Amino acid sequence: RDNIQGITKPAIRRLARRGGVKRISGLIYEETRGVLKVFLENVIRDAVTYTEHAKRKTVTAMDVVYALKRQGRTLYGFGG
Amino acid sequence: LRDNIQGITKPAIRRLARRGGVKRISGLIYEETRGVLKVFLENVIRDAVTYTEHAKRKTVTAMDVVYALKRQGRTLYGFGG
Amino acid sequence: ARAKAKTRSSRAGLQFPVGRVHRLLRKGNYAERVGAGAPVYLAAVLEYLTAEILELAGNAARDNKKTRIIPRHLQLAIRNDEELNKLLGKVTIAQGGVLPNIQAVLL
Amino acid sequence: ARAKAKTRSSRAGLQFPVGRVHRLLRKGNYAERVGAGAPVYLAAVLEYLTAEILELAGNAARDNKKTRIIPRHLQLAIRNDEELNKLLGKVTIAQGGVLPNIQAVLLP
Amino acid sequence: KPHRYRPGTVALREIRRYQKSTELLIRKLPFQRLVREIAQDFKTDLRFQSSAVMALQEASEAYLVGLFEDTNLAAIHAKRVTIMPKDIQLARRIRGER
Amino acid sequence: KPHRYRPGTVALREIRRYQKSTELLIRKLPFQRLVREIAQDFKTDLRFQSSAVMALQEASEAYLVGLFEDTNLAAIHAKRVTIMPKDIQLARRIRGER
Amino acid sequence: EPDKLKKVLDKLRLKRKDISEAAETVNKVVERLLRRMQKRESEFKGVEQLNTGSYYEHVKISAPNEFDVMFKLEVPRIELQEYYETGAFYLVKFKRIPRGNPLSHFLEGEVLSATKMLSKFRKIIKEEVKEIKDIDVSVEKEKPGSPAVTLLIRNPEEISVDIILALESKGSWPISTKEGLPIQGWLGTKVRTNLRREPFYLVPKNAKDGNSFQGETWRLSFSHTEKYILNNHGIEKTCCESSGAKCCRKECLKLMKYLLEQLKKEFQELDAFCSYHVKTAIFHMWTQDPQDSQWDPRNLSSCFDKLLAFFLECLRTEKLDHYFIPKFNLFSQELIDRKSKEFLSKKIEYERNNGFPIFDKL
Amino acid sequence: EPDKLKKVLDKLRLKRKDISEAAETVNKVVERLLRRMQKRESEFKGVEQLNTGSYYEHVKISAPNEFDVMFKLEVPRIELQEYYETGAFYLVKFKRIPRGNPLSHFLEGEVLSATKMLSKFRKIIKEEVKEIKDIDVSVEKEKPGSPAVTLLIRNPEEISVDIILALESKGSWPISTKEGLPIQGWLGTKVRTNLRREPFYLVPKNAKDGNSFQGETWRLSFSHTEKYILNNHGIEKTCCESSGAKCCRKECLKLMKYLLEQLKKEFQELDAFCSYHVKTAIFHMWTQDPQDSQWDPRNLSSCFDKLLAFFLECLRTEKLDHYFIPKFNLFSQELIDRKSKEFLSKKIEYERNNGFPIFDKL
Amino acid sequence: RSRKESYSVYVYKVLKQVHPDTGISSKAMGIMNSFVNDIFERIAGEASRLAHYNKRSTITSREIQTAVRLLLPGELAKHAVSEGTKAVTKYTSS
Amino acid sequence: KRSRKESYSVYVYKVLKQVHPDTGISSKAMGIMNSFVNDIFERIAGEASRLAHYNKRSTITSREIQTAVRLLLPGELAKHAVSEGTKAVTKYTSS
DNA sequence: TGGAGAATCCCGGTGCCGAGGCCGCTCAATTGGTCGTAGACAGCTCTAGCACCGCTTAAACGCACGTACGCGCTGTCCCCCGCGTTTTAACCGCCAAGGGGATTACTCCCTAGTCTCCAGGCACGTGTCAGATATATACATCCTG
DNA sequence: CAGGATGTATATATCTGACACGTGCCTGGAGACTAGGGAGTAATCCCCTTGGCGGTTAAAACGCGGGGGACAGCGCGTACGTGCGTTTAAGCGGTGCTAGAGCTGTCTACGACCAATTGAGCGGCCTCGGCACCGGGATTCTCCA
Ligand SMILES: [Zn+2]
Ligand SMILES: [Zn+2]
């Protein structure tokens, strides 16, 4: 139960290509894995706190919208 | 009253950058600094003018300035806050 | 004995609501009373901005040779203007894409 | 009747105004009804936080061998803690000073 | 020899198609595995709709590709072509995230 | 020869005293001259208290010295010792200010 | 009889052989001149020739002492302000333009001063004409009522050319053109969408003087669509070439066109009925024409009396709703008087009942 | 008579010459041991000896089979929770600690388990004692009521040493010490501020068992201040050395101290009146003593009957408000019974009226 | 029995006003709805802070226009000012 | 006229003496503290507003205060504030 | 290694002024009593999260080929820095004056609130069309020789 | 350079499922009125901001040397681009199910609101104590041997 190595290196390569990259150092994969991990930890912690005061057992999308908003990452297209 | 932009003395910039922790000071960066500093000032002072104007005052207080920093997300204390 | 409704949207000659808006205003816990021209002013500014957006939206979309509106067009158009991107910088857009761009040093 | 007027802060055993707080709350234009313990709750929160603040403030202050307080050591203590600094990230402070540090690369 | 392409060339056409495209490049399964993996720490035993998951994948992909362009320009100013960790660190630094 | 100091040395003691100090390094007169100079564009014929002016000098000095440390670290990652404009541009860039 | 139509057609062909040499010298020198325009610094840096072809069916032509070449110039974001509420002419204003449009000195406040730009354009073109004098060329100053810059050329004969500026606009495809151009059933909506995806023009021409702005009133222009629908007239679009069943549409087009040319040159009271009238007329005839069998040289006479019948039917009904603008019924008494139309019908009956006597000549 | 006081003083000096050799061997081996403590991995990495000097006026001493060495250990942010509302003992809890304090397993919930750390400390010290055996040393396990780790040393005689842990704290200078230590007029607030700028200690000692937490009740400790105020007793602070007018303060200190030592060793009912009593007593005497002329060997007998008078005056008033803690009136019947104090006064009268018979011996 | 309000009506109205020739994927619909709402929230909170500074009990369009000027980029603000002012003056004459 | 203004400097000094009565203070930092107090309260207040909106509630209780601070503050700090708040409210229920 | 001014810390007296204590007092808190209502249970109904179960298939990985990118190094060469001269001009304090914001009363107007009818959006359902899939053609490019 | 093979826009035809209309409904917005009190303005005052005149001294600008950090360039080695065949795990559809979010009733504590009275804190004066600050000895320092 790790799944962080489940983000396959050529997928990361494709993503970085979409980010406009010429050459790709082979060390950066675990680096970015950890950094994205930290990011997801922030987001998911906010959304879980939301969900808790929402007294819910399932999780919705609008809580996440508020999470992104409060992290200054305002996005639409997912209701609201 | 003209050419006050060159009132920004280079050694002031140098000492400022020293407090900013830099070591060698390229001779071109002063007018760059002046311009970037200037546009920052303009970004503040436009909203400050708008503030005092809606405040119907012929004068400028400090609270408007504070609110400018607020809306710009650069909130300051030490002047009432 | 009625005076059958002439909508305040029509009475300001606009599409955007005044009743629904004014409802949302009073039911927003902002102020107890709210002046009658404030929703008019609001609905006018917002309708103007709305149309301004939708203008460039249709522009981009027809340039792209498409039939309906997709996010890509919107992201492009927004970032192909200062004042929009100035006022809409940190917004994010799902399926919007990125502005294609490459520094000349990379060639 | 007409018993001695008593602060609700004594009934909470704290040093913050409860009447003033609940007033400004009701002058804050947020809601319609206000849960009786919520001003007390918030006030207790704020008391614990300002205690945390002024503690380390005076700590730093005596570490500068000083009696009264200046923005310098305050901003230092801010930029030394993890949780508070992260909370108070973009905050700017008049004459707060810079947190002194130099890169080892800049060093011989 | 006959059509063996030079480096970057293939990557140039790729970057062209990518900046033209908008869809995701992620198999959503290990991603949401990690979602529940991070989630269970704070509290386990919770369900969710897939909409929020797709929103997460979207926002995360968006944030990282923004970082990709920022670190790209950073290495550009650094006058190199291959990535490094220090630019990423300085990116987080300048935004105050570290 | 007898006590002619090497470069940076004097600057090191300076940086020590500076990061220890908190006061300003600006003659306030041309600064507020430029304040009214920028101000008059939008509208002239306006007065002000000096408190706000000092607040301006404070906030401006603060913002620029923050940029100084950021551009310093930028040149550090760039593995140099002298400043350049491109790091400053990239600083504004990463914050979306340009 | 189709043989007399072919002989006058061959007369037009011989005249076209004269126009080949004449207008080809003309086309080369204005190509040279327009090339000089792009290197000459101006707000008219990008101003290139709008080709409409070279045939009689491709350029609107008269007497050999006059010619016309269409010029295009792209324009940024443009709001369309109608003053002619019939739907034929609009005003000239911009949109927001955050960058800043470099024509404010030419902008009458918010309106666009067509006078000033036309003035300065005539200035720079006469400037360039006296700068290089390879071929014998000079600008002619005619009356300020028709904004067409005539350039007298002494090579080989005196050939004047009406220089007119058309503006390439990607602005709106206005609400006047919503229910315009109906080809949904007879031709197809697919093409129609693709067509309306393209740009369009507006010609600066001083209309009827019930207006504050003269010259600054501008009429709609879609000449690209017209040459498109010209080469795509029939139900099988591959016609006018060797691969389709050759109709008589261009034939009857030129017949009625130069019939009316000769008719106004012999009856000088009637001049307002310009070329666009028969163009919209044949468009509506086509949208009511379902069959190709009634467009062929065997049916040339039948279809031509049919065209006369259709046009005279439109005159008695007094309605000719424009193709692009069906709200704009161009059969308006304000611009074209009724008694003129009656004598026009009389001249049509003259041509009709007397075996077309103005085409026994050549 | 001051001569008999000087002869018993010289007896204490000869005993001090014995303690020099004995306690110097002791000081070197616990220095060695404490050195071994720092290389031994533990939560007690930084634990160094708190020196208080070596004199009889610098270490609290008894029978040669016992010794004491003070150890210091720094501590992070510590909240002070009073349970002893007289003001003499507190509880042991931390503050927020964002980094995370590495003693949670030792933290009884929020309280600090003095039992566990004392247990593990005795464990690691006996571990290290059996690891290296240069000098003959062993740990003695006495009754779990006095948390002083006695280390029996067979070099040269059986010298046990009470190892006790004192915690270096920069935490609060609590509200119990606000109106404590009054030296504002007689000595100075300047020094007082500088003194309160420094750290302080707390000794883990199981008080009166009216408490849930035994051993985890901790008494206040300021031994640095006590040795400071010892070397700075007089109004001219340069005294006890050669540069000032030599008083009898250390003299009368040791006189009353070892008078009470002999007195409890010959009257075994009275043992609770430990060393700190006369220390706070002489502090209050000093704060009511304005003159240095009444502290000199010429005035030695006068000042000593004066000290007896002051202490007996405090007994009849039954108040001895502590120097650091004036709210904490240590003359409380709950810890020191009244009839004991009465017989104590009787033994003082015994020593007083009979020319001090317990000091005609040596 | 769960009627909810939306603005797709007025969106489509203004849409067909400036361009009656266009379909849409409904993603963008909610995008602009949420968008304008968030904008108006900034405006409302802003004018609240202003009326607080002005110690007022209600809101008219003067404070609105000034907050707009305070918050909007360049000549767009002057445009929108013209729009709002002329439409309100128009509406008063009704 | 005179416009007697509100300031927390009284209560700041109160809590100050409640922890460090030995330490002197300036008034500039005092206003800094008052201002910052107001700012965080504004953050929390607008939050609690938007949250009670998300639950469509006409009332705000201590649970919401608790969740708001927890959503705003990191780690151990949040737990301690929860403890303090809960304790003093329950105390006040017993008066 | 010294050394030698150069900074840099540590004690003394003095203005000084300001942080903190005291008086008046006022308005906001407190108490009690009223009432409408918000949410708190309390069940009752659809849906969509998990979960599997085969099933395909392109993605990952592992491999090898090779080249070119940072890295280390050498000369070199303006360019910041350390120092002295003049200037210059920002503060330190004064007074004038006027203006402009803060305060009161009065009035007005406009929304809050009531009650009445009306249509607007929505939920749902259908008919059609936009572009994906698949295929195939024609051109854009790079790569070596 | 040129060809050639791959890569890609173009063009046709097909289907489907999204998107625009249709309709009934009834939920909240127009009509009309009244309260009544918040905002606009009228006079005043006071304080405070800008102007300005005269020293001073520290700071800034300008000349000047020097060495050093940047940089142009040069080998190198490896690791990351480029293909390829094998595994594999992502996604399709189905089935289902059940727990949990939404709905509705109702009643009940609870906060909103009005009166009297009070004391606390806030405006303003007294005051000593930190506390710069200049002077004067102590202690790193580093470029030189
Ligand atoms: Zn043909
Ligand atoms: Zn002595």
The DSSP annotation for G258-282 comes to: HHHHHHHHHSTT-----THHHHHHH
Q: How many whole angstroms separate alpha carbon H217 and alpha carbon H135? A: 35
Ligand showing the shortest atom-to-Cα distance for residue G245: 1
Residue ranges with CB less than 5 Å from ion ligand 2: H 240, 250
Strands G158-159, G137-140: parallel, antiparallel or unpaired by DSSP? unpaired
What is the number of structural domains in chain I?
Answer: 1
The answer for residues whose C-beta is within 8 angstroms of residue E98's C-beta and 6 or more apart is: E89, E92
Task: Specify whether the CB–CB gap between C70 and C95 falls below 8 A.
Answer: yes
How many folded domains does chain A comprise?
A: 1
The span from the CA of F69 to the CA of F65, in Å, is 6
Q: How far apart are CA F78 and CA B26, in angstroms?
A: 15
Q: In whole angstroms, what is the distance from residue G300 CA to residue G309 CA?
A: 14
Count of CB atoms within 10 A of residue C103's CB? 10
CB contact at 8 A, D85 and H101: no
| Alpha helices in G40-73, H assignment, sequence order | none
Q: Which of J20, J21, J75 shows the shortest C-beta gap to H98? A: J75
Q: Are residues G149 and G257 in the same domain?
A: no
- Residues I60-71 as b or e (16 or more Cβ within 10 Å = b): bbebbbbbbbbb
Residue position matching structure tokens 């992909």: E61
**Chain D contact for F20, CB < 8 A?**
yes
Residue I15 lies in a domain: no
Statement to judge: residues G43 and G186 lie in one domain: no
> Which residues lie below 8 Å from residue G141, measured CB to CB, with a gap of 6+?
none
Structure tokens at B3: 């050419």
Q: Which residue is nearest to nucleotide L119 (CA to C1')?
A: D5
- Please choose, from the candidates G71, G73, G69, the residue with its C-alpha nearest in 3D space to the C-alpha of residue G26: G69
Query: Known binder of ligand: residue G205?
Result: yes
Q: What is the nearest nucleotide to A25, using C1' and CA?
A: L80
Binding-face residues of I in 33-92 toward B, CB within 8 A: 49-50, 53, 62-63, 66-67, 69-71
Q: Is F21 on the interface with D (CB under 8 A)?
A: yes
Residue H154 Cα to chain centre, angstroms: 26
State the DSSP string of C22-56.
HHHHHTTTS-SS--SHHHHHHHHHHHHHHHHHHHH
Would you say residue J2 lies in a domain? no
Domain spans of chain F, in order of start: 9-98
Residues H277 and H281: their CA atoms lie apart, in Å, by 6
Integer Cα distance of B46 and H305 in angstroms: 84
Please state, in angstroms and rounded to a whole number, the distance separating the CA atoms of residues A61 and A59.
7
Chain A CB within 8 Å of residue C93 CB? yes
Residues G216 and G343 placed together within one structural domain of the fold? no
DSSP for G209-274 reads S-SS-SSS-EEEE-HHHHHHHHHT-SSSTTTTSSSS---SHHHHHHHHHHHHHHHHHHSTT-----
B39 touches chain F (CB under 8 A): no
Judged by 3 or more CB pairs under 8 A, whether F touches D is yes
Measured in Å, residue G344 CA sits from the centre of ligand 1 at: 29
- Spacing of C-alpha A80 from chain mean position: 20
Q: Quick one: which H or E segment has residue I47?
A: helix I27-53
> Kindly report the CA angle at D46 between D45 and D49, in degrees rounded to 5?
90
G22: containing domain: 15-172+200-221
Q: Which residues in chain A have their CB less than 8 angstroms from residue C71's CB? A: 77
* CATH value at residue J68: 1.10.20.10
Distance CA F72, CA D101 (A): 12
Q: Given the structure tokens 């379902």, which residue do they identify?
A: G290
What DSSP string runs through chain B? ----GGGS-HHHHHHHHHHTT-SB--TTHHHHHHHHHHHHHHHHHHHHHHHHHHTT-SS--SHHHHHHHHHTT--EESS--
A31 in contact with E at a CB cutoff of 8 Å?
A: yes
Would you say H12 is a known binding-site residue? Answer: no
Q: Are residues G319 and G185 in the same domain?
A: yes
In angstroms, rounded to a whole number, what is the distance separating the alpha carbons of residues J28 and J36?
A: 12
**CA of J4: nucleotide with nearest C1':** L122
Which chain I residues are within 8 Å of B47, Cβ to Cβ? Answer: 70
CA of F49 to C1' of K107 (A): 37
Angle at Cα A58 formed by Cα A57 and Cα A62, nearest 5°? 120
| Residues of F in Cβ contact (< 8 Å) with B79 | 51-52, 54-55
From the CA of D64, how many Å to the C1' of K9?
Answer: 14
Residue type for position H25: T
Same domain, yes or no, for G271 and G287? yes
E strand map for H93-134: 107-108, 111-112
Min CA distance, B73 vs chain F (Å)?
12
Both tokens of G97, joined, read 């333009």
Among A34, C92, C71, A18, residue whose Cα is nearest residue E25: A18
Rounded CA-CA distance B66/B60 in Å is 12
Distance I57 CA to L31 C1' (A): 26
Residue G221 marked in a binding site: yes
Sorted by sequence, the CB contacts under 8 Å of residue G270 that are 6+ apart come out as G263, G264, G340, G343, G344, G347
Longest dimension (CA), chain B: 48
CA distance F98 to chain B (A): 11
Establish whether chain I is in contact with chain H, requiring a minimum of 3 CB pairs below 8 angstroms.
no
Task: Name the nearest CA neighbour of B53 among F51, I70, F34.
Answer: I70
CA gap G38, G41 in Å, rounded: 7
In sequence order, the β-bridge partners of residue G153 are G137, G159
Is G68 annotated for ligand binding?
yes
Which residues of chain E have a CB within 8 Å of the CB of C98? 19, 65, 69
What stretch of H or E contains H349?
helix H338-353
Q: Is C56 on the interface with I (CB under 8 A)?
A: no
In a domain, I17, yes or no: no
Question: What is Dmax (Cα atoms) for chain G?
Answer: 65
Whether residue D53 contacts residue J35, with contact meaning beta carbons closer than 8 Å, is answered with no
Can you give the distance from the CA of residue G58 to the C1' of nucleotide K75 in angstroms?
Answer: 73
- Any chain C CB within 8 A of the CB of G98? yes
- Residues D79-108: b if buried by 16+ CB within 10 A, e if exposed: bebebbbebbeebbbbbbbbeeeeeeeeee
G114/G91 Cα distance (integer angstroms): 10
Kindly tell me whether chain J and chain A come into contact, counting contact as 3+ Cβ pairs under 8 Å: yes
Q: Which residues pair with G90 in a beta bridge?
A: G82, G218
Question: How far off is chain B from I93, nearest CA to CA, in Å?
Answer: 26
Please say whether the beta carbons of F55 and D93 come within 8 A: no
Ligand having the closest approach to the CA of G251: 1
Q: Give the nucleotide with minimal C1' distance to the Cα of F11.
A: K81
Which of the ligands is closest to the CA of residue H250? 2
Rounded to whole angstroms, how far apart are CA atoms J12 and J9?
5
Distances (CA, A) of H351 to A26, C102, H252, H346, J62: 90, 101, 14, 9, 69
Overall residue count recorded for chain G in this entry: 362
Nearest Cβ partner for H96 among J20, J21, J77: J77
Cα radius of gyration (chain F): 18
What distance in Å separates the CA atoms of residue I47 and residue B71, rounded to the nearest whole number? 13
Residue of H nearest to D62 (CA): H197
Q: Please report, for residues D93, G144, H245, the alpha-carbon distance to residue D98 in angstroms, rounded to integers and kept in the order given.
A: 10, 73, 52
What backbone phi and psi angles, to 5 degrees, belong to B25? -120, 95
Tokens 């000033």 found at: G116
Q: Looking at residue E69, what DSSP letter applies?
A: H
Cβ–Cβ gap J54/A52 under 8 Å: no
| CATH number, domain with residue B31 | 1.10.20.10
State both tokens at G277.
Answer: 């009238």
Q: Per the structure, how many domains does chain H have?
A: 2
Amino acid at G37: M
Residue of I nearest to B56 (CA): I54
Question: Which residues 174-233 in chain G show a CB within 8 A of chain I?
Answer: 175, 178, 196
Domain, as residue range, for I36: 24-92
d(CA H216, CA H112): 7
Q: How far is B11 from chain J (nearest CA, A)?
A: 31
Closest among G163, G356, G330 to G262, alpha carbons compared: G356
Give the SS3 label for residue G354: coil
CB E58 within 8 A of CB E74: no
The reply to whether G265 touches chain I by the CB within 8 Å rule is no
Largest CA distance in chain D: 80
Q: H198-203 — which CB contacts under 8 Å span 24+ positions?
A: H198/H224, H198/H225, H199/H168, H199/H169, H199/H170, H199/H224, H200/H169, H200/H171, H200/H173, H200/H224, H200/H225, H201/H50, H201/H72, H201/H166, H201/H167, H201/H168, H201/H169, H202/H90, H202/H92, H202/H166, H202/H167, H202/H169, H203/H164, H203/H166
**Cα A62 to ligand 2 centre (Å):** 79
Smallest Cα distance from E55 to chain A, Å: 7
G240 among the known binding-site residues?
yes
Q: Which among G95, G98, G197 has the least Cβ separation from residue C62?
A: G197
CA nearest H96: which of J18, D12, J74, J90? Answer: J74
Domain that holds residue B27: 1-79
Residue D68 CB-half CA count within 13 A:
7
What is the phi/psi pair of residue H194, to 5°?
Answer: -60, -40
Find the residue closest to K122 using CA and C1' atoms. I3
CB contact under 8 A, I28 and A74: no
Q: Is H303 annotated as a binding residue?
A: no
The residue in chain B having the minimum alpha-carbon distance to the alpha carbon of residue I66 is: B54
What is the distance between the alpha carbons of residues G98 and F33, in angstroms, rounded to a whole number? 30
Place of tokens 């702005």: G213
CB hemisphere CA count around C87 (13 angstroms): 20
CA distances from G350 to F54, G263, G340, G356, G362 (A): 94, 11, 15, 8, 19
Residue G322, annotated ligand binder? no
Report the Cα–Cα distance between both ends of chain H, in Å, rounded: 16
